[PDB]
Enzyme design. Structure first.
Site, PDB file in Angstrom:
ATOM      1  N   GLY A 125      -5.640   5.396   7.987  1.00  0.00           N
ATOM      2  CA  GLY A 125      -5.536   4.703   9.250  1.00  0.00           C
ATOM      3  C   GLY A 125      -4.271   5.063  10.002  1.00  0.00           C
ATOM      4  O   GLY A 125      -3.364   5.721   9.495  1.00  0.00           O
TER       5      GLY A 125
ATOM      6  N   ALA B  24      -1.904   3.030  11.292  1.00  0.00           N
ATOM      7  CA  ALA B  24      -0.694   2.289  10.950  1.00  0.00           C
ATOM      8  C   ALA B  24      -0.025   2.842   9.703  1.00  0.00           C
ATOM      9  O   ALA B  24       1.199   2.757   9.573  1.00  0.00           O
ATOM     10  CB  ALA B  24      -1.017   0.811  10.754  1.00  0.00           C
TER      11      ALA B  24
ATOM     12  N   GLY C 185      -6.513  -2.184  11.782  1.00  0.00           N
ATOM     13  CA  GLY C 185      -7.453  -1.231  12.321  1.00  0.00           C
ATOM     14  C   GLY C 185      -8.655  -1.023  11.425  1.00  0.00           C
ATOM     15  O   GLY C 185      -8.604  -1.219  10.213  1.00  0.00           O
TER      16      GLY C 185
ATOM     17  N   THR D 229      -2.965  -8.936  17.241  1.00  0.00           N
ATOM     18  CA  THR D 229      -3.290  -8.021  18.330  1.00  0.00           C
ATOM     19  C   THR D 229      -4.788  -7.952  18.609  1.00  0.00           C
ATOM     20  O   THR D 229      -5.238  -8.289  19.707  1.00  0.00           O
ATOM     21  CB  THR D 229      -2.757  -6.620  18.012  1.00  0.00           C
ATOM     22  OG1 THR D 229      -3.398  -6.124  16.829  1.00  0.00           O
ATOM     23  CG2 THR D 229      -1.251  -6.662  17.794  1.00  0.00           C
TER      24      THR D 229
ATOM     25  N   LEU E 282       6.566   2.633 -13.470  1.00  0.00           N
ATOM     26  CA  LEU E 282       5.473   1.979 -12.757  1.00  0.00           C
ATOM     27  C   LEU E 282       4.335   1.545 -13.661  1.00  0.00           C
ATOM     28  O   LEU E 282       3.470   0.792 -13.208  1.00  0.00           O
ATOM     29  CB  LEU E 282       4.935   2.899 -11.666  1.00  0.00           C
ATOM     30  CG  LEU E 282       5.588   2.857 -10.282  1.00  0.00           C
ATOM     31  CD1 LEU E 282       7.011   3.385 -10.267  1.00  0.00           C
ATOM     32  CD2 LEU E 282       4.728   3.661  -9.324  1.00  0.00           C
TER      33      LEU E 282
ATOM     34  N   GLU F 280       4.985  -0.292 -16.262  1.00  0.00           N
ATOM     35  CA  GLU F 280       5.428  -1.587 -16.760  1.00  0.00           C
ATOM     36  C   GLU F 280       5.204  -2.705 -15.744  1.00  0.00           C
ATOM     37  O   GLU F 280       4.892  -3.833 -16.140  1.00  0.00           O
ATOM     38  CB  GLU F 280       6.899  -1.499 -17.167  1.00  0.00           C
ATOM     39  CG  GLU F 280       7.130  -0.552 -18.340  1.00  0.00           C
ATOM     40  CD  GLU F 280       8.589  -0.422 -18.730  1.00  0.00           C
ATOM     41  OE1 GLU F 280       9.449  -0.982 -18.023  1.00  0.00           O
ATOM     42  OE2 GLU F 280       8.879   0.248 -19.744  1.00  0.00           O
TER      43      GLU F 280
HETATM   44  N1  G2P Z   1      22.225  -4.385 -25.919  1.00  0.00           N
HETATM   45  C1  G2P Z   1      21.414  -3.610 -25.197  1.00  0.00           C
HETATM   46  N2  G2P Z   1      20.185  -4.029 -24.909  1.00  0.00           N
HETATM   47  C2  G2P Z   1      19.491  -3.139 -24.178  1.00  0.00           C
HETATM   48  C3  G2P Z   1      19.909  -1.916 -23.710  1.00  0.00           C
HETATM   49  N3  G2P Z   1      18.897  -1.300 -22.995  1.00  0.00           N
HETATM   50  C4  G2P Z   1      17.897  -2.144 -23.059  1.00  0.00           C
HETATM   51  N4  G2P Z   1      18.186  -3.272 -23.777  1.00  0.00           N
HETATM   52  C5  G2P Z   1      17.257  -4.347 -24.142  1.00  0.00           C
HETATM   53  O1  G2P Z   1      16.217  -3.780 -24.919  1.00  0.00           O
HETATM   54  C6  G2P Z   1      14.933  -4.257 -24.461  1.00  0.00           C
HETATM   55  C7  G2P Z   1      14.163  -3.119 -23.840  1.00  0.00           C
HETATM   56  O2  G2P Z   1      13.839  -2.161 -24.867  1.00  0.00           O
HETATM   57  P1  G2P Z   1      14.104  -0.624 -24.661  1.00  0.00           P
HETATM   58  O3  G2P Z   1      15.424  -0.351 -23.999  1.00  0.00           O
HETATM   59  O4  G2P Z   1      14.132   0.025 -26.072  1.00  0.00           O
HETATM   60  C8  G2P Z   1      12.600  -0.021 -23.879  1.00  0.00           C
HETATM   61  P2  G2P Z   1      11.570   1.045 -24.895  1.00  0.00           P
HETATM   62  O5  G2P Z   1      11.845   2.523 -24.918  1.00  0.00           O
HETATM   63  O6  G2P Z   1      11.679   0.498 -26.346  1.00  0.00           O
HETATM   64  O7  G2P Z   1      10.091   0.784 -24.432  1.00  0.00           O
HETATM   65  P3  G2P Z   1       9.459   0.792 -22.973  1.00  0.00           P
HETATM   66  O8  G2P Z   1       9.416  -0.597 -22.459  1.00  0.00           O
HETATM   67  O9  G2P Z   1       8.083   1.421 -23.104  1.00  0.00           O
HETATM   68  O10 G2P Z   1      10.338   1.723 -22.146  1.00  0.00           O
HETATM   69  C9  G2P Z   1      15.242  -5.418 -23.527  1.00  0.00           C
HETATM   70  O11 G2P Z   1      15.316  -6.637 -24.257  1.00  0.00           O
HETATM   71  C10 G2P Z   1      16.594  -5.012 -22.938  1.00  0.00           C
HETATM   72  O12 G2P Z   1      17.356  -6.141 -22.529  1.00  0.00           O
HETATM   73  C11 G2P Z   1      21.216  -1.476 -24.040  1.00  0.00           C
HETATM   74  O13 G2P Z   1      21.728  -0.397 -23.750  1.00  0.00           O
HETATM   75  N5  G2P Z   1      21.908  -2.401 -24.794  1.00  0.00           N
HETATM   76  N1  GTP Z   2       3.137  -1.360   9.584  1.00  0.00           N
HETATM   77  C1  GTP Z   2       2.831  -1.096  10.854  1.00  0.00           C
HETATM   78  N2  GTP Z   2       1.742  -1.639  11.396  1.00  0.00           N
HETATM   79  C2  GTP Z   2       1.571  -1.288  12.681  1.00  0.00           C
HETATM   80  C3  GTP Z   2       2.363  -0.472  13.450  1.00  0.00           C
HETATM   81  N3  GTP Z   2       1.850  -0.366  14.731  1.00  0.00           N
HETATM   82  C4  GTP Z   2       0.770  -1.108  14.708  1.00  0.00           C
HETATM   83  N4  GTP Z   2       0.544  -1.693  13.493  1.00  0.00           N
HETATM   84  C5  GTP Z   2      -0.570  -2.573  13.126  1.00  0.00           C
HETATM   85  O1  GTP Z   2      -1.657  -1.769  12.724  1.00  0.00           O
HETATM   86  C6  GTP Z   2      -2.895  -2.449  13.033  1.00  0.00           C
HETATM   87  C7  GTP Z   2      -3.829  -1.506  13.747  1.00  0.00           C
HETATM   88  O2  GTP Z   2      -4.305  -0.512  12.816  1.00  0.00           O
HETATM   89  P1  GTP Z   2      -4.405   1.039  13.143  1.00  0.00           P
HETATM   90  O3  GTP Z   2      -4.019   1.789  11.880  1.00  0.00           O
HETATM   91  O4  GTP Z   2      -3.514   1.434  14.253  1.00  0.00           O
HETATM   92  O5  GTP Z   2      -5.904   1.444  13.494  1.00  0.00           O
HETATM   93  P2  GTP Z   2      -6.973   2.339  12.727  1.00  0.00           P
HETATM   94  O6  GTP Z   2      -7.067   1.905  11.273  1.00  0.00           O
HETATM   95  O7  GTP Z   2      -6.634   3.771  12.827  1.00  0.00           O
HETATM   96  O8  GTP Z   2      -8.374   2.066  13.426  1.00  0.00           O
HETATM   97  P3  GTP Z   2      -8.753   2.236  14.959  1.00  0.00           P
HETATM   98  O9  GTP Z   2      -7.536   2.630  15.713  1.00  0.00           O
HETATM   99  O10 GTP Z   2      -9.329   0.899  15.399  1.00  0.00           O
HETATM  100  O11 GTP Z   2      -9.849   3.291  14.989  1.00  0.00           O
HETATM  101  C8  GTP Z   2      -2.515  -3.706  13.820  1.00  0.00           C
HETATM  102  O12 GTP Z   2      -2.574  -4.861  12.992  1.00  0.00           O
HETATM  103  C9  GTP Z   2      -1.089  -3.408  14.285  1.00  0.00           C
HETATM  104  O13 GTP Z   2      -0.322  -4.598  14.402  1.00  0.00           O
HETATM  105  C10 GTP Z   2       3.521   0.108  12.852  1.00  0.00           C
HETATM  106  O14 GTP Z   2       4.328   0.867  13.379  1.00  0.00           O
HETATM  107  N5  GTP Z   2       3.674  -0.269  11.536  1.00  0.00           N
END
Ligand code: G2P
Ligand code: GTP
Ligand code: GTP
Ligand code: MG
Ligand code: MG
Ligand code: MG
Lengths: 423, 429, 423
Positions: free
Chosen positions: A10, A12, A134, A170, A243, A245
């Protein structure tokens, strides 16, 4: 080795992406020509020559705003096989974006995904910058997400979306967009994101000293949020939160996936002084209702989960005292049966500036957002009480009961947050 | 002889070992390269236990580094003491555990475990005599929770006699850095109570406290947060690596302390601790090192010994020292805190005196404690488990990996089996 | 020591050869005057003085297009005893090219072969650039190939031909050409090659950014194919595949000798960036249906054999992973009882440019081509149902049943690919 592609749906979303990739090139020192005079595989890929291209796909049914990229300053950055245009817009008709025109060029955009998915191996998330205003940003959004869970299923799909405003509205059939798109984004999206236009204005007016904002400046606020969510992948902090987590942390039940973004501190240039911006100072400003970007009062419900993504210059023990304050208050209160309600992420990279020391992105999956749906359900009832504008969706091939099937679907959505609110 | 193989996991436990092997570097004169520069020949006499002497004047850390994403392995190899390791031993995945115990134990835990168990086998074959294995990880993350606990059950299937110790950080009492910290504790409790011989348990908050109460620091980094455990781990085996007037090793600490195999969850203690300038205005001697240990604030696990009962007490000293200056101090303090102990052990104070100090101050002591104070933390953790379980939230991830409620329930019952047994000997006297 | 002569039949083959020998002179640095300021005996021979002549024979029954070589820029390159002209054309009449006029100057062209075959000793293949559209390019083609198997028999005879298009069709009796020429080119040609005009357009339109192509540019695409087939003879790669092997590799049964050519990567000048063109990237674009030069969908049948001729900069282990991907897919599928279906050829010579790093020629003898004959059999039935245009072929001495004798001959041809398709 780890990647995260981006899609823009779209009109926007494109102007969001015009400022986003403006910021990303300023992050890693990339020119508009894909040139720079280490680990950034998440948003970029390297050519045979020393040029980098964005992992972005721009779709539109009207040829207007894509020509603004095809002729703009950021022209040479994009692969011309990525820049995808249509001919006739949906033109604020959801049934045109979902049935009429979007069914034709759906083959090209989905084919560009696997062409990007060759060089990707650590595929960790999708980015769909789509508005609900839109028709093109909503009608194509439902058609796009159906194939991807058929394509991947297990991979992450995130939507940095734009919530339609309860007062400053709008278009006319904007209440018709939200109820129809509900069944898709509740059954495909792992974690959707709501951002209202309306709360941005007073942040621009009061906190940014410019009472009359521009849409170029509205995109600058959200573009800082999207970067600091990716601040663990693109760099190295002492506590990098990837992302995978967030969708496991912020989601207690797999239907509830609607947090809200909060960027802080939001200051002006003249107000850069008269302050010190310590890590305990700014996090209280995060839970201020007039600093968030969603028109929902946080003291009208309870917090189910909270996340805090720090950057700049942060010591965790100094943040440990800051988080101890917020649990020891009374006007700020949680869902009681979730006593472990914080996710902290620290990156040792400063928040870059687009033409300060530290910055905070707050992600709070709360029950305060559930009143915003009821404010929009009240809009949708009366426009459907007259059976107004039925002859456009039925005029473009849509069931009348498909409104009614999605009508009760919001009630099952609304009773979720009501049920989790009580003990 | 009696060499020791080192395994890491998680993300916290790697950065601890990224500081811990720096401690062992200057406890043996090891340069950042891998060569030798020490002058005291007592280092070279027992250098083999933490280092393979490779070909051509080389020394490599006998250590196994394990992660599931290439970020932390890149941070080790780029910073200090990264080129000292062997590039063959940087054995790490590509996905990241997603802060899920079930991802680290069922789906992605089965992938990299075969790459590790040959490296464990290659070091254990290369070692002349093997003493035991040590593990440094988290109990809050994903990689520290599932991946480390999946290894130890496979090792108990291998070696019955070899000891095992995990320097696992307890999930935090009050601050909530991890959203799913009960789901990374309780599913990790069941592996630790079965087949870990001794188990080290460190609270997060007291580590913030000791870095703030005694030292009075303003900006404590993880280079000074995690440094206290690095000196702590070195004080466990400091009687092994050097001769003493009363030597000790990892088997002497095990059989003295653990009274029954289900009660082996310990607490550390380190002394002395000063400020940068407030370091000379104190008689830093044995009675100061005596009373610095036994207070509540020195425990790196946040627990009150007044709200509990001890069972056994170990103490490892460093540096040259006399004995009646130690022994009467190691006898009289049992009588002033008389009711805090338990009746059925005469002279529960195990003393260990090495003859080599740390590189630094003249004398030092390492306290190894065991009490019933730790079970009161688990009742909070069992409450933190049940608060997120009485609504049965966060289940669809583990359901997506595949797990019944009974595996959650019996481990919570086995957590309560730890409750029913540390309370049992506490109720007895 | 190894040679491969070339013959050009009809008007369409000459304009192919005008761009082919344009390219060959740019390969070995030859001027248009046969001058250059090692092993290239395949396409050239040295005079007593330092001049090289092409091993080409240009036949035509009309004197028009040969004068365009006899007066053009490439004038001094050709021996005037090679440039052979007629007086009256067959003029889109196959019976005139096969009976009327071509029977007269057949003695001269065949005599020029043995005059070239003196200096040749490693005679390894023939090149007949003949179209099926014009009568001269088809009527002379049948008369020419009959004498050569009487002449040589064991030597190789290859035909880089032009397939008549199913939609964009210029002349009228183009369906009459294909059925009559079938008995010759199935009983003389060792491996014929089909190229359609129609698939070239969208390659020019989309992939080459010029929607309106010229016949000068249509010949540039096929001329790159013919060079890279000869890339093992004219140069040295680590895996040189000579022309004796292709007819032994690609032919499981001696009637099936109809593969199709596929050149890749086909990019434009502005799209030379925004890409990296790795050896795994471009080979997936080879099996894309819109990149081939034959209007046949490859996912409408099965592959019997596949060949890949690489050039530029190629490491085989990097290609080893690329070939491992294509066997491990599902929409791309082989004839199952042929599990060894790849022929790889690497040359360390870059693809030269006519006014990139690497290039791929793909030769896939598949069952997808068999539907193209059925699309042309449908054209031939109705024009013979009226007995239309019988009074021209019978008007130039041809049996009516000679159509009918060749009518069932396509059915025996068509049942071959149907029989090999099933297990
Ligand atoms: N005392 C410390 N605690 C830490 C440190 N880094 C993380 N943490 C603690 O450890 C926990 C997070 O675990 P990890 O750092 O081992 C993350 P890990 O690789 O085990 O798994 P993911 O969540 O998949 O990344 C959480 O409770 C944090 O508060 C550190 O350097 N020192
Ligand atoms: N985040 C954001 N939203 C905006 C902006 N300008 C307009 N909008 C909003 O976007 C919506 C309009 O959607 P658009 O993406 O422009 O339209 P479209 O999806 O292409 O569809 P049509 O134009 O109807 O064919 C409205 O709700 C506006 O308020 C902007 O700069 N940023
Ligand atoms: N490959 C190729 N084919 C062409 C070109 N121009 C025309 N054709 C095709 O060639 C066919 C016509 O054959 P010609 O060779 O010109 O005619 P001819 O064989 O000399 O016979 P007559 O002209 O009828 O006496 C038609 O199918 C045209 O579409 C070209 O530049 N390249
Ligand atoms: Mg629009
Ligand atoms: Mg981690
Ligand atoms: Mg002609």
């Amino acid at each position: 080795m780890r990647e995260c592609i981006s899609i823009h749906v779209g009109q926007a979303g494109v102007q969001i992406g015009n400022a986003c990739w403006e910021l990303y090139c300023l992050e890693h020192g990339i020119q508009p020509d894909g040139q720079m005079p280490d680990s950034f595989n998440t948003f970029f890929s390297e050519t045979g020559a020393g040029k980098h291209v964005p992992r972005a796909v721009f779709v539109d049914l009207e040829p207007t705003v894509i020509d603004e990229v095809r002729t703009g300053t950021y022209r040479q950055l994009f692969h011309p096989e990525q820049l995808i245009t249509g001919k006739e817009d949906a033109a604020n008709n959801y049934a045109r974006g979902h049935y009429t025109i979007g069914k034709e060029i759906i083959d090209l955009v989905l084919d560009r995904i696997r062409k990007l998915a060759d060089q990707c191996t650590g595929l960790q998330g999708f980015l769909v910058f789509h508005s609900f205003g839109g028709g093109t940003g909503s009608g194509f959004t439902s058609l796009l997400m159906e194939r991807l869970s058929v394509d991947y299923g297990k991979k992450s799909k995130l939507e940095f979306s734009i919530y339609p405003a309860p007062q400053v509205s709008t278009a006319v059939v904007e209440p018709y967009n939200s109820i129809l798109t509900t069944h898709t984004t509740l059954e495909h999206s792992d974690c959707a994101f709501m951002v209202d236009n309306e709360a941005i204005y007073d942040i621009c007016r009061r906190n940014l000293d410019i009472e009359r904002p521009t849409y170029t400046n509205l995109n600058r606020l959200i573009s800082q949020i999207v970067s600091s969510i990716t601040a663990s992948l693109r760099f190295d902090g002492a506590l990098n939160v990837d992302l995978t987590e967030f969708q496991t942390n912020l989601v207690p039940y797999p239907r509830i996936h609607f947090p809200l973004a909060t960027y802080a501190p939001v200051i002006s240039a003249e107000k850069a002084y008269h302050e010190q911006l310590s890590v305990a100072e700014i996090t209280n400003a995060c839970f201020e209702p007039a600093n968030q970007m969603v028109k929902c009062d946080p003291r009208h419900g309870k917090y189910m989960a909270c996340c805090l993504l720090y950057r700049g210059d942060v010591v965790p023990k100094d943040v440990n005292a800051a988080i101890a304050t917020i649990k020891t208050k009374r006007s700020i209160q949680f869902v009681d049966w979730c006593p472990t309600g914080f996710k902290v992420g620290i990156n040792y990279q400063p928040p870059t500036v687009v033409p300060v020391q530290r910055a905070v992105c707050m992600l709070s999956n709360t029950t305060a957002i559930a009143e915003a749906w009821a404010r929009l359900d009240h809009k949708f009832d009366l426009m459907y009480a007259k059976r107004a504008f039925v002859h456009w969706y039925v005029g473009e091939g849509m069931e009348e009961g498909e409104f009614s099937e999605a009508r009760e679907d919001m009630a099952a959505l609304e009773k979720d947050y009501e049920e989790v609110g009580v003990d | 002889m009696r060499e020791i193989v080192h395994i890491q996991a998680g993300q916290c436990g790697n950065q601890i070992g990224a500081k811990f092997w720096e401690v062992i570097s200057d406890e043996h004169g090891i340069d950042p390269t891998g060569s030798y520069h020490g002058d005291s020949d007592l280092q070279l006499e027992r250098i083999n236990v933490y280092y393979n002497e490779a070909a051509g004047n080389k020394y490599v850390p006998r250590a196994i580094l394990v992660d599931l994403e290439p970020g932390t392995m890149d941070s080790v190899r780029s910073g200090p003491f990264g080129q000292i390791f062997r590039p063959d031993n940087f054995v790490f995945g590509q996905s990241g555990a997603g802060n899920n115990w079930a991802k680290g134990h069922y789906t992605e835990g089965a992938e990299l475990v075969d790459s590790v168990l040959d490296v464990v086998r290659k070091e254990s074959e290369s070692c002349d005599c093997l003493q035991g294995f040590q593990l440094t990880h988290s109990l809050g993350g994903g990689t520290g929770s599932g991946m480390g606990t999946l290894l130890i059950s496979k090792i108990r299937e291998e070696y019955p006699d070899r000891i095992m110790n995990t320097f696992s950080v307890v999930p935090s009492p009050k601050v909530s850095d991890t959203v799913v910290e009960p789901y990374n504790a309780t599913l990790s409790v069941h592996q630790l109570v079965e087949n870990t011989d001794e188990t080290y348990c460190i609270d997060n908050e007291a580590l913030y406290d000791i870095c703030f109460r005694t030292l009075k620091l303003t900006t404590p980094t993880y280079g000074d947060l995690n440094h206290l455990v690095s000196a702590t781990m070195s004080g466990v085996t400091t009687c092994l690596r050097f001769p003493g007037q009363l030597n000790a090793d990892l088997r002497k600490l095990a059989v003295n302390m653990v009274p029954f195999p289900r009660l082996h969850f310990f607490m550390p203690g380190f002394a002395p601790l000063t400020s940068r300038g407030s370091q000379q205005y104190r008689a830093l001697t044995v009675p100061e090192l005596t009373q610095q240990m036994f207070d509540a604030k020195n425990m790196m696990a946040a627990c009150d010994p007044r709200h509990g009962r001890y069972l056994t007490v170990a103490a490892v000293f460093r540096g040259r020292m006399s004995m009646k200056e130690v022994d009467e101090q190691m006898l009289n303090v049992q009588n002033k805190n008389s009711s805090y102990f338990v009746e059925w052990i005469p002279n529960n104070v195990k003393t260990a005196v090495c003859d080599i100090p740390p590189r630094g101050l003249k004398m030092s002591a390492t306290f190894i404690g065991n009490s019933t104070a730790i079970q009161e933390l688990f009742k909070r953790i069992s409450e933190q488990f049940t608060a997120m379980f009485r609504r049965k939230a966060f289940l669809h991830w583990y359901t997506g990996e595949g797990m019944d409620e009974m595996e959650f329930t019996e481990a919570e019952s086995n957590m309560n089996d730890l409750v029913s047994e540390y309370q049992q000997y506490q109720d007895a006297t």
